[PDB]
Amino acid sequence: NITIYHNPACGTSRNTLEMIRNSGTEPTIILYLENPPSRDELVKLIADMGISVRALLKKNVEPYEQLGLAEDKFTDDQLIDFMLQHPILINRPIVVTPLGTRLCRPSEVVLDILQDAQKGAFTKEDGEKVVDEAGKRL
Ligand SMILES: [Cs+]
Ligand SMILES: [Cs+]
Ligand SMILES: [Cs+]
């Protein structure tokens, strides 16, 4: 039972999705930009990810800029509510498996929470080798 909060336009997100598949399972895919998590779900994801709320914020997007979120003037719950109202602010991808939840940045972080080993070598779309045929991380 695996869930990925996915942006098809994000390289990291695509690489993550394919490494999930290369472990032998097809995840549930949530297009978070159109279908974001509810507040309770987002609070849980952050807790499980063990990062700060601010660490989940995506920079270099219109609401981050226009809402001035770079500045340290926002409580965690103010930031959580911005993410729910403007889901492009949620960094990506987030993956949930029976072992845990991670912000998979870089994509190969997902290897931590995939229960089954990569079934063969994995090379990222830009050619960066990740695991060899033997299964060793490079
Ligand atoms: Cs499986
Ligand atoms: Cs939801
Ligand atoms: Cs806009």
Ligand SMILES: [Cs+]
């Ligand atoms: Cs693992």
Ligand SMILES: [Cs+]
């Ligand atoms: Cs890249």
